[PDB]
Amino acid sequence: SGNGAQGTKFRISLGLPVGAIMNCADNSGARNLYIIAVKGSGSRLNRLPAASLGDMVMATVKKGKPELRKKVMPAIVVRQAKSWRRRDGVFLYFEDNAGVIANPKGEMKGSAITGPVGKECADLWPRVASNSGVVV
Amino acid sequence: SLARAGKVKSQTPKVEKTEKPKKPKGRAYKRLLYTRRFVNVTLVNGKRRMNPGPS
Amino acid sequence: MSDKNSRIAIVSADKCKPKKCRQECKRSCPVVKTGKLCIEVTPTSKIAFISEILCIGCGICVKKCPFDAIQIINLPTNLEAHVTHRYSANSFKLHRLPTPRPGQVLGLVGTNGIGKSTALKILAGKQKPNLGRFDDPPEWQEIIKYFRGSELQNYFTKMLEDDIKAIIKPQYVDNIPRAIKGPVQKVGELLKLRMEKSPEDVKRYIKILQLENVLKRDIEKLSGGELQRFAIGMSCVQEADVYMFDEPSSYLDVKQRLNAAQIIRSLLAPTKYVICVEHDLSVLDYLSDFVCIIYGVPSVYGVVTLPASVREGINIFLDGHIPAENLRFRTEALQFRIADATEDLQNDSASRAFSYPSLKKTQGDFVLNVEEGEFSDSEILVMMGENGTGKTTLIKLLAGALKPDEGQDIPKLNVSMKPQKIAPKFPGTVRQLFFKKIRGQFLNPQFQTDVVKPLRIDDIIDQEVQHLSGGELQRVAIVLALGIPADIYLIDEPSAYLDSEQRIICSKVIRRFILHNKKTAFIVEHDFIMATYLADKVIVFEGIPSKNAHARAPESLLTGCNRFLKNLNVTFRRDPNSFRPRINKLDSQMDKEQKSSGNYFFLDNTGI
Amino acid sequence: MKVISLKKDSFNKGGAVITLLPEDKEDLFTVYQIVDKDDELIFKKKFTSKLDEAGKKKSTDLVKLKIKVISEDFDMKDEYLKYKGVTVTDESGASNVDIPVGKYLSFTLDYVYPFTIIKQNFNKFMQKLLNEACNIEYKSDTAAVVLQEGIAHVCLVTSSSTILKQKIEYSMPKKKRTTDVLKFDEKTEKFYKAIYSAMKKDLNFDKLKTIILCSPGFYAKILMDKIFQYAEEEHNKKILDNKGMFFIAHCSTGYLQGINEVLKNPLYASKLQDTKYSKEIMVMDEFLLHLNKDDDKAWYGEKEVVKAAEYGAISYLLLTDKVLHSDNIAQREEYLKLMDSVESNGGKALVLSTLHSLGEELDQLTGIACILKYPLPDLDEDDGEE
RNA sequence: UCCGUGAUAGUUUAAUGGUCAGAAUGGGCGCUUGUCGCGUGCCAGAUCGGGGUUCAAUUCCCCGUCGCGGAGCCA
RNA sequence: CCGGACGGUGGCCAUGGAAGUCGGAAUCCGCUAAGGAGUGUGUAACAACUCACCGGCGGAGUAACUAUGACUCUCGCCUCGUCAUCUAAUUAAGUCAAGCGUUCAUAGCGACAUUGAUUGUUCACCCACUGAACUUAGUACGAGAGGAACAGUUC
RNA sequence: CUCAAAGAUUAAGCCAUGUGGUAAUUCUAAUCCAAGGAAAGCAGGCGCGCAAAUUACCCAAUCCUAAUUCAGGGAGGUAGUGAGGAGGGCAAGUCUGGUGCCAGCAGCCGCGGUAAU
Numbered sequence A: 001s002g003n004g005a006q007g008t009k010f011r012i013s014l015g016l017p018v019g020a021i022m023n024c025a026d027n028s029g030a031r032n033l034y035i036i037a038v039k040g041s042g043s044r045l046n047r048l049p050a051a052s053l054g055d056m057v058m059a060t061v062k063k064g065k066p067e068l069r070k071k072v073m074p075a076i077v078v079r080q081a082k083s084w085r086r087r088d089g090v091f092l093y094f095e096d097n098a099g100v101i102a103n104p105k106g107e108m109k110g111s112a113i114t115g116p117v118g119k120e121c122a123d124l125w126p127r128v129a130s131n132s133g134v135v136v
Numbered sequence B: 001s002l003a004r005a006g007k008v009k010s011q012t013p014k015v016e017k018t019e020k021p022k023k024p025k026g027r028a029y030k031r032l033l034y035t036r037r038f039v040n041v042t043l044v045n046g047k048r049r050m051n052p053g054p055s
Numbered sequence C: 001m002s003d004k005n006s007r008i009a010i011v012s013a014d015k016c017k018p019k020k021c022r023q024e025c026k027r028s029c030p031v032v033k034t035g036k037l038c039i040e041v042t043p044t045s046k047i048a049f050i051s052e053i054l055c056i057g058c059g060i061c062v063k064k065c066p067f068d069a070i071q072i073i074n075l076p077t078n079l080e081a082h083v084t085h086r087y088s089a090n091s092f093k094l095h096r097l098p099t100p101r102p103g104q105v106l107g108l109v110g111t112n113g114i115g116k117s118t119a120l121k122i123l124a125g126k127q128k129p130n131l132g133r134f135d136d137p138p139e140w141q142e143i144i145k146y147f148r149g150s151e152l153q154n155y156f157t158k159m160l161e162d163d164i165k166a167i168i169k170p171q172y173v174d175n176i177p178r179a180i181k182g183p184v185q186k187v188g189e190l191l192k193l194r195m196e197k198s199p200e201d202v203k204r205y206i207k208i209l210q211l212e213n214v215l216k217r218d219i220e221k222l223s224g225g226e227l228q229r230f231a232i233g234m235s236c237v238q239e240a241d242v243y244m245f246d247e248p249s250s251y252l253d254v255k256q257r258l259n260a261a262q263i264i265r266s267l268l269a270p271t272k273y274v275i276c277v278e279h280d281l282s283v284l285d286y287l288s289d290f291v292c293i294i295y296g297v298p299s300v301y302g303v304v305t306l307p308a309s310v311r312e313g314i315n316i317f318l319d320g321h322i323p324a325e326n327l328r329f330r331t332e333a334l335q336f337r338i339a340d341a342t343e344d345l346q347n348d349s350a351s352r353a354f355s356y357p358s359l360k361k362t363q364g365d366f367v368l369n370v371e372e373g374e375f376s377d378s379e380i381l382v383m384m385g386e387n388g389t390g391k392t393t394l395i396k397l398l399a400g401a402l403k404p405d406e407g408q409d410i411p412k413l414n415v416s417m418k419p420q421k422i423a424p425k426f427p428g429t430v431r432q433l434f435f436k437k438i439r440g441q442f443l444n445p446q447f448q449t450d451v452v453k454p455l456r457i458d459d460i461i462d463q464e465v466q467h468l469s470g471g472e473l474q475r476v477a478i479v480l481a482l483g484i485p486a487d488i489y490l491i492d493e494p495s496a497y498l499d500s501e502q503r504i505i506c507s508k509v510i511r512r513f514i515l516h517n518k519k520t521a522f523i524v525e526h527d528f529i530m531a532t533y534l535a536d537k538v539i540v541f542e543g544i545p546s547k548n549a550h551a552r553a554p555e556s557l558l559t560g561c562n563r564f565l566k567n568l569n570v571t572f573r574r575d576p577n578s579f580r581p582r583i584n585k586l587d588s589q590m591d592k593e594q595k596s597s598g599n600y601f602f603l604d605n606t607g608i
Numbered sequence D: 001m002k003v004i005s006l007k008k009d010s011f012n013k014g015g016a017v018i019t020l021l022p023e024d025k026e027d028l029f030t031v032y033q034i035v036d037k038d039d040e041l042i043f044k045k046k047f048t049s050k051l052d053e054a055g056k057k058k059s060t061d062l063v064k065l066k067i068k069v070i071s072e073d074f075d076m077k078d079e080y081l082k083y084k085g086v087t088v089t090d091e092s093g094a095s096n097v098d099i100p101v102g103k104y105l106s107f108t109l110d111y112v113y114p115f116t117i118i119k120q121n122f123n124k125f126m127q128k129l130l131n132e133a134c135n136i137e138y139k140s141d142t143a144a145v146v147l148q149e150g151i152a153h154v155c156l157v158t159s160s161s162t163i164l165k166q167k168i169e170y171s172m173p174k175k176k177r178t179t180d181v182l183k184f185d186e187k188t189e190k191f192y193k194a195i196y197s198a199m200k201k202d203l204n205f206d207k208l209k210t211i212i213l214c215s216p217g218f219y220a221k222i223l224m225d226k227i228f229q230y231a232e233e234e235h236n237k238k239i240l241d242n243k244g245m246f247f248i249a250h251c252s253t254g255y256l257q258g259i260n261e262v263l264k265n266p267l268y269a270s271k272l273q274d275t276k277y278s279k280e281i282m283v284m285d286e287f288l289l290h291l292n293k294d295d296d297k298a299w300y301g302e303k304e305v306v307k308a309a310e311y312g313a314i315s316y317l318l319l320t321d322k323v324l325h326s327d328n329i330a331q332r333e334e335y336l337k338l339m340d341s342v343e344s345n346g347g348k349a350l351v352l353s354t355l356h357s358l359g360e361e362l363d364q365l366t367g368i369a370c371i372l373k374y375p376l377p378d379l380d381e382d383d384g385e386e
Numbered sequence E: 001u002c003c004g005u006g007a008u009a010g011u012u013u014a015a016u017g018g019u020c021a022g023a024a025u026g027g028g029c030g031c032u033u034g035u036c037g038c039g040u041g042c043c044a045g046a047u048c049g050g051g052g053u054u055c056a057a058u059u060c061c062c063c064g065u066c067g068c069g070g071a072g073c074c075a
Numbered sequence F: 001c002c003g004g005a006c007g008g009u010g011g012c013c014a015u016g017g018a019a020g021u022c023g024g025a026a027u028c029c030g031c032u033a034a035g036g037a038g039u040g041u042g043u044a045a046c047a048a049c050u051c052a053c054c055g056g057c058g059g060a061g062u063a064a065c066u067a068u069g070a071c072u073c074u075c076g077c078c079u080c081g082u083c084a085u086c087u088a089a090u091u092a093a094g095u096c097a098a099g100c101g102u103u104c105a106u107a108g109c110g111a112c113a114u115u116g117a118u119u120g121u122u123c124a125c126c127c128a129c130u131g132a133a134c135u136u137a138g139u140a141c142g143a144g145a146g147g148a149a150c151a152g153u154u155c
Numbered sequence G: 001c002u003c004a005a006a007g008a009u010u011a012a013g014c015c016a017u018g019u020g021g022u023a024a025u026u027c028u029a030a031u032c033c034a035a036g037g038a039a040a041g042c043a044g045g046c047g048c049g050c051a052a053a054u055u056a057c058c059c060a061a062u063c064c065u066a067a068u069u070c071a072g073g074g075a076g077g078u079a080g081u082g083a084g085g086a087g088g089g090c091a092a093g094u095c096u097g098g099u100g101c102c103a104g105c106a107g108c109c110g111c112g113g114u115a116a117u
């Protein structure tokens, strides 16, 4: 979360600790995203920081265009897999872990998002809304 | 160095062209050529020449 | 290497007096120091001229100018590619033009000074574009070449040959009364002559526009809304292929502007080409198939974008940014208070404000009825409804300007009032007038942001009000009402003559002062968005225009909005991205579902 | 510049015979102001480039021409100084041998080979410009100190050029077996004294601004504190007023290399205090501080600074690289008088490079400006303008 | 840092008994040789800075400055 | 507590401009009750305040370039090395006050003197995160550059 | 003047436009999205490069396609756009002023260091 995130976010189950790799779901040239940090996460001895739906992470691209590899950039988690629970009572989950590469302000690097996108992320990051097909 | 670029052209003094009889064009000019080269001839100092200045 | 850039200088002659400064522009400029050309003096008109070729882009001249007459900007050579026409040296230049298409309606939207008016003339054949050059003696031939690569190229060949003669509904709303009297004699005469179409067309057109009463009146006599509509009538009646409308929503009320939009669209059905320019988004959305956005600084330049979709163009407009152009055309984004956002106070003040009983005002040709309502302190009430309903009459009675036929309202309160139609009738200059009302209001920083800096009143200060302009005068009048202290303030239709940025400056103005000062305000309006921002309660007027009317007590924002919008029968679901009203078509399942819920509009509120 | 010789004949009290090597385009401009028409130079080229005609034919050689000067083609931007002339015709055979007499011949100067100036009009003004430097324009302001653990170079920039003036060097501390065997601290202590003495003498230590102190290791920082220790000992307020001439840098390499490692690498430099933008920036600040609060205590431009000087209100003089090196020679005389003139009424001086944002701001201002000590109203009147 | 060990002409290094300082090279000097150079004749030190003793100190003490080697423990 | 604080004259030289008030000495005269060739605040520069003082109250030489050294001559510690490469990432108290602080000793400082990788690693060095976000508000102040909070909301 | 090649080489690279419901299709009982869903031919543009034209007119001809006509056809046809040399090899003696191994020439050979074939 943080910059450019207009909205607050209700807690959702943390799915992705540091080291996790999600699918890159944009058209940027990136094939996956390797999580090295979660923004706005706190501190407890021994705890991995771990992201969830609509969290902004800091990632590198393990697989993808060489102009994207070997460096750290912001991304946003768009699909989960660890099931979480909404305030309408529902426990839900996607089939994959996936997020999209983005700028500190929260602008997509790419122009499409392939696959669905959870609403809690859509609601959080307007330029993600824009590029989303099926939401939730 | 770039320095010099265009030194000489820019330091040659202008002299404008002169105003001269218009040369005829085409067939007429060939005519002039044929009479100048072949009809009333010109010189033959030793053999022949086609333009020197003082000789 | 580095990207490419340019310099463009535009100077306002109104602002410039070389005597006081001296031709300081030339003396101070560094290029001229060296012996260069950047600023040349024109001995004739006695004006400074700045050549864009030699200028450095230093901006030294701009700072030195005592007034603020010179403006130099640096652009990435965005403007140079597009040049259509320029008025003259160091003046407004137009860039790109809007595409016309047969069988459809193409919209145009922009802030004032963009050249939307100019663009119409060029398409009309009224003015020939110089092409930012000499082109003058009819050189239509060159214009096609300039347009090559654009769809307008075909249109320009058509225009030159004069196969088509476009019909133009004139833009300047203030200018029209002077030009025509009668049309010659009375509106009715105009409609009979112009009617190339069906005899049905005379009757049908009048019925739909609500022109029935107005036929006998003369054009000069007409009120602003009436004046607009007669022009629209003539643009349906005419026989032609191309019908150009330039600002058809001006002066019109909320009910009427929607009506105008439908009728104009009917032209597309006969497969006649239509073009339109609008300041109103509600109206623009309904009319258009395709939309162009015009952007750039006012009076400096204005470029037209490539054609876009109806939905798409509107969405981009509200962002305040355009990607290809990469310009943030508007400094701040428009937002509406949620109503969660507002401050929470227990309101009464002295226990509630004053209250009015039933009132009636009858002219003898129109009758107004008012239901007893209450007003409270520190609140704001919107007044909505069609003109001729007695929205204006009601405010006057509260002002004490008018005496009620029945009912009475004698309050102790001090009232400040702003009239609806503003025509100058005060001798004096602008600064003198505003200073008499209150100085010190002029000192405040709020007033610098909203009035003084945007327009540049400093230059206006010497100018006469008779000599003045429409929109500029409007912002000044609204501010003046706020100039003096009063328990209650009354404003009538602040949106007139104003573009997008201008109205929204006003919206912030009324809400902020009222909240702060803890005073009350009544505002009359046609603009949906303006009412939403300012108000807490609303009064809706109903009845039939030019006949009778009725008023209601104040009711909550949700309650009042449902009633008003129910009269129109257009729902404005919500767009998820823009948070904008999204219009809903008649007979529908989604729209039908809403009718059963009672939701005309949506905001960041709970609701299905 | 490197001056190989310079002697004063016995038969000529006046003139001189100077053998010299110009090293950069600043040193070309130096040559210019020394060399007169009718002086002689003997240089080399590469003539023998005959007819044909009898034989092939040429030969080659490396033939040196004693040419008397007649004219010059001088282009500072282009790094081109050329002397036109006639052969002196050394009929004595000692010189000029192998050249064919009666035939003009030119010298395009190079930084490669030295040349001899047989001078007629060797004056005291030229002598200044031959043994102090000759930038009456001033581009630089720097000195450096590289030290590794065992080697040091005191470096230094010029009075004119990015041209070393004095390659100092001490016994540097080398990380010995024991706690760093005390010879370290005494020997380092020496160096400060050695560098302070050299810079005091070489310069007028009011001309340079910069000492960069550069090391691989903590050595630089150790040395800074050591400088200011000894500073307090002597009550050396030439050092103590002035936290802004030393600037503390780290590098990998530290030979003459180290300097260009430090500068050009964005580790320790940028547009912060390197001190050759130092007072250059600080005074150009104060110049706009005054001028934009329309106070009459800053003034600008070649017309306007010369008038702000006539009123004799001016302290810190703002001069440029551009207006000097853009193209023009002569012109920079005028401004040099104008600096002294102004200081003869009040002030220091700052030359800013126009290769930078600040110099560009001042250049849009004709590359010449001022700050005054005092307001002197309407300096733009008497002289006519704004 | 302790204890060892030095330093002599432009440079590297011989040397003494307290009264006396060299070599070699490098250089400056000519002659060779077409001309330079190799060669061949000719040439010229405040014995590191420092104070002291003594008739007399390069030589005998004492210190520093520098360059060297050799140690360096159980944490 | 308050009134008065004055003429020679803006002393003199240094003077860019120094008219008492950065500076070099010199301290007079008339006035009248008392008013310094002038205590501190000084606009550049007078003013305009003020106050004192009357009063009302083994080692070296070598360079048709720096460096190196073909040549002549003599008897893996520092290290976490540097460049790449693999990583998002890689040991894989205080006193005195001379001074600064452009004008001013103490705002802020003060000489002299004195009372997650990598590694066993600690450490160190990077990569990230974050009390924060949201409206309050691009607001108040500011020529701009820029930039608040108290209230309410969610983590 | 008559005859007319023509964006293939570069990138088979990319392309603007020419009784009822429903956002909308010739709806049917990488682009537009009422978020549901629906969609290398002429000219002409971008790009690419050393490199290739017009958004025109027409069925008259030549023929073609549909049934007993004379419909259709950017197949096709008309128009628009769209031609140095004077040292030698080379043939000219090259002559007069400026330049000095600078500027420049010169396919090679070679010119050019005040008297430049």
Ligand SMILES: Nc1ncnc2c1ncn2[C@@H]1O[C@H](COP(=O)(O)OP(=O)(O)OP(=O)(O)O)[C@@H](O)[C@H]1O
Pocket: C087, C088, C091, C092, C093, C110, C111, C112, C113, C114, C115, C116, C117, C118, C119, C298, C299, C300, C301, C302
């Ligand atoms: N006669 C003229 N001389 C010079 N410039 C002119 C002239 N007429 C119009 N302009 C310029 O063209 C621009 C204006 O007009 P147009 O009439 O094209 O505006 P619009 O785009 O219709 O704007 P608005 O919404 O304000 O009516 C102006 O900003 C102005 O500078």
Ligand code: SF4
Pocket: C015, C016, C017, C018, C019, C020, C021, C022, C023, C024, C025, C048, C064, C065, C066, C067, C068, C069, C070
């Ligand atoms: S534009 Fe301004 S400065 Fe220039 S003449 Fe006019 S008033 Fe003077």
Ligand code: SF4
Pocket: C028, C029, C030, C031, C032, C038, C039, C050, C054, C055, C056, C057, C058, C059, C060, C061, C062, C072
């Ligand atoms: S911007 Fe600069 S350069 Fe251009 S006209 Fe003004 S002063 Fe001259």
